[PDB]
C-alpha cells in the first residue's frame, strides 16, 4: 500500500 | 458487520470525508452502482491489473455471504480498504486449547454448555444468547452440545 | 493537394480506425463482459457440476 | 501546413485510435479466446455434469 501511496498514511 | 462497527469507533468521520474524496478520484469504474466482477476488471486494468484471482472470483462468488452474488461495490471496496492491516491478535490454537481447558471443564476434550456460558458471563462484554444460538451452531461443529478443541479452535480462532 | 489526399487518408483512416477501433473497443467489452458470464457460466457449469458429482460422490 | 498538419495530427489521431484498437484487438482477442476457453471450460464442466449427471443416475 503505502509502496503505492506515500505519506498519506499517517494516523495509521 | 460486528468488525465494521469496532474500527469505526477507533476513529472519525471526517476522516471519511476525505475519504470520498480520494474516492470522487477513484469512484470510476462501477459499472451497476456495484463494484461487480467487470468493475473488478475495469478498475483494476486501469493500472493494467486485477486481484490475484483467488482474491478476484473469490469476491465474485464466494465471500457474498448474504446472496449478494457477485462483488458489490460494497464487496470491492471490501477488498480495497481491508488492504492496511490493524486485527488484533487472532486468538488461535494454544490460547484455544488452554481455554478448552475450562471450556471443556469436563476434562474430556468435549465442552458443555455452561463452561462457556460462565467464560461468555466473564469475559467483559455482551453475550446475546442470539449469539450463543450462533456459538452452539459454531463450536460445536459436530453442534452435539459437547465440543471437540478443534471445532471450538475455527469457533473461535483469528479473532481479537 | 497531396496533403489534403493525406488529410484525407490520415482522417479518414482516423475514422476507419476510429471505426476499427470502435469495433474492437465494443468487441473487447463484449467479449469482456461475456468472458465474465463465460467465466460464471463456467463457474456455474462447474458449479452445477459439483452439485451432480458431489450427489455422484 | 494546415493540410499536411490535418494529415498529421489525424494520423496522431490515429495513431493513439490505431494504439487502441491494437490494445483493444488484442484484448479482444485475449478476451475472446479466454471467453471461448471459460466456455470451453464451461462446456467442459457441462460436459462433465452430463458425464456425472448421467453416472450420477
Known sequence: ?12 | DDIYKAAVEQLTEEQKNEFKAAFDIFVLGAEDGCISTKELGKVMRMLGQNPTPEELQEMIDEVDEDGSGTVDFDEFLVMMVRCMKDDSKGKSEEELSDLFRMFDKNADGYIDLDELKIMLQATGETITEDDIEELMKDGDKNNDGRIDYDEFLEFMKGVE | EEAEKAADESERGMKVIESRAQKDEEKMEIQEIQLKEAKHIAEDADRKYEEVARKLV
Open chain 1, 1 to 12: 500500500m503505502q509502496a503505492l501511496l506515500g505519506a498519506r498514511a499517517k494516523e495509521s
